[PDB]
Amino acid sequence: LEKGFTHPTDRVVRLKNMILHAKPYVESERAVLATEAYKENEQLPAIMRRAKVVEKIFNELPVTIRPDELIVGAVTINPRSTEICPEFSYDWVEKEFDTMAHRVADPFIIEKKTADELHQAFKYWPGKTTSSLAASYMSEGTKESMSNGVFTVGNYFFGGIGHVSVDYGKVLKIGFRGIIDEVTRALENLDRSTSDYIKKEQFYNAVILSYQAAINFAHRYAQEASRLAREERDPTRQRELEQIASNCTRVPEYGATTFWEACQTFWFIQSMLQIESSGHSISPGRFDQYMYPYLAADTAISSEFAQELVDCCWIKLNDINKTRDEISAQAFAGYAVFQNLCVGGQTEDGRDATNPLTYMCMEATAHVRLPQPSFSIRVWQGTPDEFLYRACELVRLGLGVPAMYNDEVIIPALQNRGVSLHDARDYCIIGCVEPQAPHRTEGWHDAAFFNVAKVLEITLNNGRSGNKQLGPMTGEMTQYAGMDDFYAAFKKQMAHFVHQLVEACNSVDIAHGERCPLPFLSALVDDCIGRGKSLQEGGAIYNFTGPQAFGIADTGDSVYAIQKQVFEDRRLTLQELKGALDANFGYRSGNPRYEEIRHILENSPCFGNDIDDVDLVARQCALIYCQEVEKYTNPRGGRFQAGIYPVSANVLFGKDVSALPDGRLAKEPLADGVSPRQGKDTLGPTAAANSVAKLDHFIASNGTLYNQKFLPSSLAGEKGLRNFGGLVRNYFDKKGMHVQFNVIDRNTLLEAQKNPQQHQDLVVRVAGYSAQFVVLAKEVQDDIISRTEQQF
Amino acid sequence: LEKGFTHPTDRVVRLKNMILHAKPYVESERAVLATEAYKENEQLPAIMRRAKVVEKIFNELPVTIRPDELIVGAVTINPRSTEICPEFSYDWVEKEFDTMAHRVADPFIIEKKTADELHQAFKYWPGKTTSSLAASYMSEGTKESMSNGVFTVGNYFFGGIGHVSVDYGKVLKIGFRGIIDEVTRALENLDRSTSDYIKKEQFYNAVILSYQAAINFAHRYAQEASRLAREERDPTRQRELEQIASNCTRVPEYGATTFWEACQTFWFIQSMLQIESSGHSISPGRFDQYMYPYLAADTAISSEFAQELVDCCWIKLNDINKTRDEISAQAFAGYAVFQNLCVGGQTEDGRDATNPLTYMCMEATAHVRLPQPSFSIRVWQGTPDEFLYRACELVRLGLGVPAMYNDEVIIPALQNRGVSLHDARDYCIIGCVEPQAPHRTEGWHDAAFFNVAKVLEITLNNGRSGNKQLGPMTGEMTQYAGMDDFYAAFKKQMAHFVHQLVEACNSVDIAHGERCPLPFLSALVDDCIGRGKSLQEGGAIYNFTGPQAFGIADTGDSVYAIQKQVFEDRRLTLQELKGALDANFGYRSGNPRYEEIRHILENSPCFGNDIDDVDLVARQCALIYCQEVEKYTNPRGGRFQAGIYPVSANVLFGKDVSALPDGRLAKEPLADGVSPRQGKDTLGPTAAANSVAKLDHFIASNGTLYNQKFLPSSLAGEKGLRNFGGLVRNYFDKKGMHVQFNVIDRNTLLEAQKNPQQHQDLVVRVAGYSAQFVVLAKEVQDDIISRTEQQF
């Protein structure tokens, strides 16, 4: 059960190190072309304008094929660089012209020719962003709440949406000409009796015009592959390019007939989508399922060469990059675009879905060892031991991937939200940990972060934050009688802020629906073509909005600490807990009663130790959150659904919370997702796993996230892997939704800190994705080093 | 019965002449302020952007009290001038910069400071107009039909909607501050458990800001009234001014307290609506019904000063003007904004509504004798003889006023469209001849002009116009087996073109609903405040779209000519008639066979002579249109309903049509509304009355327009009045909807052509409104001259 990994070809390693060495830039071509496309087409409906944006970008964005590539397609000229998408938001880019190359998290080079031309185009945009329109639909108190860091909807307000697994399989089989046929045939069968055929007809005419330029983009890479073949001196590389040219002339305009073609089809879809919009989490989904039929009917390709194309695709998935404002960028830190590819799991009928491309994807990860993709596996009851005990063997490489997702919790959870058993069985994972029925969902799976710790802070402070009346006056802390009177005030505060959070999410939603529906993306999700409506107008079968709680373990161990240390053991007064909270447990003041109260509170039973009383409080606070969220609906007919996952913002939004009744000093990091709090699960990985499984994962149907970290030597040998497999299975059997493990010594991370030059390829999990450790700001690195170390 | 007419005050005669001796200017200030408000507010929802538009104009537009006015409120610096609303269209204004002052129909002085001022603002606009959006929603086939003269939606394409009678009485009781309070009580009762509140709340927040602004606008006219009063050195005019100043400080901010303030509340509404949007046919409606409480409740006011105030309302209604592109101006000729004001009829409770203010509204029209208001009376079985005779005795002054509307056809016509009996009973007339339940409707009572004559042309040419295949090839003329085959072809044509006519009107509808929902107007129509929506989004209780037919008589007498002279009486063959039609009856060749054929067709029986044979063809052809318009719905959720009236384009649209089977030569005029062809009704008015009544007026529920012209001596004496009253009852009793009259000698109109400088105040009826005869183009003049002269 201990099988080892093969090596990649010298080209793959060359292709890899190109990603690894490359310095990221901001680039202006797409922002200039896009801008000029809005200028020329003020008079069209938003859909037809957006078709003109992609037609001009596809027709004119520089074509770039890199030395040694087999799969081709590049969003920027320079590897790992970013375009600028000012249709969503701009001003923060021009503010950081001079600072973005020197900033802490995710720095980018902005050289002056680029700032000059990005400066020009930005003169068009003031108040024409989707963000500025989303800003205007918001109530005043909702901005105020977001300003005091209760919650934020920055992801889709600053940037695009994305967060979708499109119908890769459809384009592989009928092509772009196939999509166009389905739209011309829909266009003939329009009911033209009422008024509402007119906007539909506009959608269709947009979708067709986008795919006619989405064809010309492929062709337009094809002529540059021939151009490079006629001018190439190595005869063998000449023939690679002549046939790369042949691959791009057929796909994706038509269906794939080789594997090579099928791999190139995948990449144009994956790449072109992130040109139309800067939405990240364009997640390839079940790429072992919809890419395998093309491998099996390739009776010409060899084993080695198939694996090399899977390695190339992996490396191209790392070519995408995306800049955010100095502060947003610390929450998605690592040049991360969160493109999630799951292998394994069930077919829609019930059989296991393992196939030979499942293991080659597992090999490709072990070949490339880069942060993308967000490689994942699906676990269900019939999962072959050979599969789990091979994903495990891969995990022990200490890249963080695969993350593991549980069919037996996610599938019933998707059903609770109106997903059919047939569609739930086909689920993929989006971005970090969020499940959807692929190519039939507008997910909005990271619309917002929401800081439940901050709601506890405010709850205790009578609706106040700072000295600013931010929430309802639900009683002063010193006037609670029991925990009943707490959960009363806490539920009221939760209904206030969740209602505000929803207003913010729906405002960004109306915004995107009204100023920037996508005619390209929309044709690759059911049911936009049949319904003649964009994803942004509710075109998908299933519609959701996913806001993220965190500070969950924090809120819990805190609410329990008040229960135990004030009401049950009577070891302090409510007034003393107030005075201690206010004084930051006397951190500056050196007040020793407030340190003695801290010490008491630090040593309360903690969520994460298989202790029912404290685990049930973590569960109840998690529920209070998740239950408010699901009451509310979005403008596309869909229902909000809670998730608990921290991207890299648990250090960031930790700064928004004062000292909590669990002994946490003001402004320190918060708990990552549903992980037990940093270093406070002390009895080992099963005790930890058991506690996390007591949370209602089913109701948090936008996905939960659990982080464990192992030292390597505790996963060495075959009874290393046998225990690592029995813990996954124990956790999933006890109804937990997800777990992903770091496997790394702490001196490794410490030497990564002191000597960054010699750890450029050290890749580890942050949360729901992996990153290069040295790209992470030190406060984040320390949070990762502070996470508990599990031992068998 | 002959009672006579009082004379107006010398003041009213100075105010009358001020209108008459005005030179219309194009002005810029409201066009520039509108433009700056757009620039400043790119980021806002459209409804909110339109609050800031109306706000800037209201807070900043020049305030102008004209000498002598008792009722003040001016749209333009210069009397009887036009503003510019570039949001709907702009480009024709700039193309006409130097031509507009010199064109034939409706010139305007543009001074160059005005042109430079407009030139600059227009730089903002390319592509951002409602015209531009409306246009790109229409299909190439629909633009082609329009380009070839089959039909036009230009009215709401180039300009605003209007065509409304708002809730004056509600602003009269509770004022703008009362409107603000309904929006606050709506805002506080909002169901905030969905996403639908976010847009209803913008609209409410948009209605308050507009109505605050409107209150400043009235307050500003008061500061001007007081500024002038401090400098007045005639004491009579001084108290007048400080008494106007008091009126504008109460009304319409609050409810009217005297009759004077009720009048200044009216005029502020009637003026300011036309400031936010250039949509015309802003129709006062039941003015005698909703002002009269405030006249009765004034125990202080004299009848002489009450009648004088009502006269300043008539004059102040002539102060409004609107320029259109130079072709448009030909179809809405005469500086005409069609603000229709009716008196009399039934209450909601079924009994007669005459009150002392009814006869004061007739006396106004005898005093002022200017084109506006488009003065109307309602008639039902229970009309007191007093009122019909006094209304005639006024029609006999030969201004064209009042037009006459039949309750017994209009009320059930609206019931067939879903209007309650309670609501239809209270109906007023919009524009020319279009009825609505006032303040409960967005009726679009002039969405389009649809050329029925042009469709006959296109049918007999197998769907061609020029050598260009415009409709289905329904079969060639030479192959008709009888009149059955023709109607088959005619109805397939009408179904094709009416479908595009709908696609046209609905694009203009979507355009307006997306780029110019009006928060000010919207608040004075049920049920916009209740529902949280604008008139452009279906806020109204009732919703319609009214296209108009041209050449009904023309289609009728042509179809019948075929039936009789070809199939019945074999005087022509199908081929000869194709040759003669195609050769314009040899108007140019000199072909005598075609000259013979012309004489044979043109001497067929004609609609308007009480001849059932031919009158029922007219009924059939009008139905074919009316019955097809009926099938379609609009984006606000209401039915299309066909009207029949010509405004001023029965000449202009005749130009689009070849020779027809009735012997009309190519490009000659078409027949006005449902009236007989010009001079073809030769057996007298009672015989023509009977013919127009055989038509189905009920299905044509956007209104039909019948014209008659009379020898002044034939209506002389009270024998003339008993005759004239007995003709109106004849035609109403026989289920005809509307009749209006000219009372004018032929040589009066001839001398007016030949010494226009001594007939400046000759007002006559054109069609559903009256205009200075001399202002009209010679071809429109000649058309009115060429109308049949009735004689008892």
XYZ file of N, CA, C and O in Angstrom, chain A residues 113-167:
220
model
N 4.837 52.502 -18.111
C 4.105 52.482 -19.395
C 2.716 51.939 -19.112
O 1.738 52.489 -19.643
N 2.639 50.930 -18.240
C 1.356 50.288 -17.894
C 0.508 51.224 -17.034
O -0.703 51.325 -17.290
N 1.102 51.903 -16.056
C 0.346 52.861 -15.225
C -0.162 54.004 -16.102
O -1.299 54.456 -15.889
N 0.654 54.444 -17.066
C 0.272 55.513 -18.018
C -1.022 55.127 -18.734
O -1.956 55.944 -18.771
N -1.081 53.921 -19.294
C -2.234 53.521 -20.130
C -3.393 53.024 -19.258
O -4.560 53.238 -19.656
N -3.116 52.411 -18.105
C -4.191 52.124 -17.130
C -4.750 53.432 -16.572
O -5.958 53.465 -16.285
N -3.905 54.455 -16.383
C -4.353 55.806 -15.967
C -5.391 56.336 -16.955
O -6.442 56.839 -16.512
N -5.084 56.252 -18.249
C -5.948 56.782 -19.322
C -7.326 56.132 -19.257
O -8.327 56.853 -19.134
N -7.374 54.804 -19.345
C -8.643 54.055 -19.429
C -9.520 54.340 -18.208
O -10.750 54.402 -18.352
N -8.910 54.525 -17.040
C -9.655 54.761 -15.788
C -10.432 56.081 -15.834
O -11.335 56.251 -14.997
N -10.114 56.990 -16.763
C -10.867 58.260 -16.882
C -12.289 57.984 -17.347
O -13.140 58.870 -17.197
N -12.540 56.803 -17.903
C -13.872 56.441 -18.426
C -14.811 56.012 -17.294
O -16.020 56.315 -17.357
N -14.262 55.328 -16.284
C -14.999 54.465 -15.328
C -15.700 55.142 -14.155
O -16.618 54.539 -13.609
N -15.297 56.336 -13.657
C -15.907 56.860 -12.432
C -17.430 56.699 -12.387
O -18.136 57.304 -13.187
N -17.900 55.852 -11.470
C -19.334 55.637 -11.242
C -19.991 54.749 -12.282
O -21.232 54.720 -12.326
N -19.209 54.054 -13.110
C -19.745 53.117 -14.119
C -19.345 51.692 -13.758
O -19.601 50.789 -14.568
N -18.765 51.497 -12.574
C -18.451 50.154 -12.057
C -19.721 49.438 -11.630
O -20.698 50.097 -11.226
N -19.678 48.112 -11.670
C -20.700 47.303 -10.981
C -20.670 47.609 -9.480
O -21.749 47.717 -8.872
N -19.479 47.758 -8.898
C -19.327 48.083 -7.462
C -20.068 49.377 -7.111
O -20.838 49.371 -6.139
N -19.845 50.462 -7.860
C -20.453 51.773 -7.529
C -21.987 51.678 -7.557
O -22.645 52.404 -6.769
N -22.545 50.810 -8.415
C -24.004 50.563 -8.471
C -24.444 49.715 -7.282
O -25.510 50.003 -6.720
N -23.664 48.691 -6.929
C -23.898 47.880 -5.715
C -23.839 48.765 -4.469
O -24.670 48.576 -3.555
N -22.892 49.707 -4.431
C -22.761 50.673 -3.325
C -24.074 51.436 -3.143
O -24.502 51.647 -1.995
N -24.711 51.816 -4.246
C -25.863 52.737 -4.211
C -27.143 52.029 -3.743
O -28.014 52.703 -3.173
N -27.275 50.720 -3.961
C -28.476 49.967 -3.532
C -28.432 49.655 -2.038
O -29.424 49.126 -1.522
N -27.334 49.961 -1.352
C -27.150 49.535 0.048
C -27.724 50.576 1.002
O -27.637 51.786 0.725
N -28.310 50.101 2.094
C -28.756 50.983 3.180
C -27.529 51.559 3.874
O -26.424 51.006 3.746
N -27.752 52.637 4.611
C -26.668 53.407 5.234
C -26.075 52.615 6.390
O -24.846 52.583 6.525
N -26.930 51.987 7.192
C -26.478 51.187 8.335
C -25.765 49.928 7.899
O -24.966 49.402 8.688
N -26.038 49.447 6.686
C -25.317 48.270 6.158
C -23.883 48.656 5.793
O -22.974 47.861 6.086
N -23.668 49.826 5.185
C -22.285 50.304 4.959
C -21.580 50.439 6.310
O -20.447 49.956 6.440
N -22.252 51.045 7.291
C -21.682 51.299 8.637
C -21.260 49.973 9.279
O -20.162 49.915 9.876
N -22.089 48.935 9.155
C -21.772 47.600 9.708
C -20.515 47.051 9.037
O -19.572 46.668 9.752
N -20.488 47.055 7.701
C -19.297 46.630 6.934
C -18.092 47.493 7.327
O -16.991 46.934 7.414
N -18.283 48.795 7.611
C -17.159 49.699 7.968
C -16.555 49.319 9.318
O -15.337 49.480 9.493
N -17.375 48.872 10.264
C -16.871 48.374 11.559
C -16.627 46.868 11.508
O -16.531 46.260 12.581
N -16.520 46.282 10.318
C -15.917 44.951 10.166
C -16.761 43.837 10.749
O -16.191 42.780 11.100
N -18.074 44.046 10.850
C -19.019 42.965 11.218
C -18.972 41.899 10.124
O -19.068 40.705 10.439
N -18.823 42.325 8.873
C -19.011 41.466 7.685
C -18.638 42.263 6.440
O -18.689 43.505 6.480
N -18.274 41.566 5.368
C -17.794 42.218 4.127
C -18.249 41.450 2.893
O -18.283 40.216 2.933
N -18.557 42.172 1.820
C -18.972 41.559 0.538
C -18.010 42.026 -0.546
O -18.446 42.222 -1.698
N -16.732 42.179 -0.189
C -15.712 42.716 -1.102
C -15.438 41.834 -2.316
O -15.070 42.373 -3.378
N -15.598 40.518 -2.188
C -15.171 39.566 -3.236
C -15.819 39.922 -4.571
O -15.089 40.126 -5.548
N -17.147 39.980 -4.622
C -17.891 40.184 -5.885
C -18.235 41.653 -6.111
O -18.861 41.975 -7.140
N -17.881 42.516 -5.168
C -18.112 43.964 -5.303
C -16.875 44.600 -5.934
O -17.025 45.346 -6.911
N -15.682 44.240 -5.460
C -14.429 44.655 -6.128
C -14.252 43.896 -7.441
O -13.975 44.537 -8.462
N -14.442 42.581 -7.439
C -14.121 41.767 -8.618
C -15.321 41.104 -9.265
O -16.472 41.432 -8.922
N -15.048 40.189 -10.196
C -16.079 39.359 -10.820
C -16.549 38.256 -9.893
O -16.022 38.117 -8.778
N -17.504 37.464 -10.362
C -18.128 36.409 -9.538
C -17.358 35.105 -9.732
O -16.644 34.693 -8.802
N -17.453 34.497 -10.914
C -16.883 33.161 -11.144
C -17.603 32.108 -10.316
O -18.837 31.983 -10.426
N -16.846 31.367 -9.508
C -17.350 30.364 -8.539
C -18.340 29.417 -9.205
O -19.497 29.289 -8.756
N -17.866 28.761 -10.253
C -18.719 27.895 -11.089
C -17.834 26.847 -11.745
O -16.689 27.158 -12.113
N -18.356 25.627 -11.840
C -17.812 24.571 -12.712
C -18.699 24.500 -13.946
O -19.818 23.964 -13.854
N -18.214 25.050 -15.052
C -18.967 25.106 -16.329
C -18.987 23.725 -16.989
O -18.323 22.797 -16.491
N -19.749 23.602 -18.076
C -19.982 22.322 -18.783
C -18.809 22.043 -19.726
O -18.989 22.079 -20.957
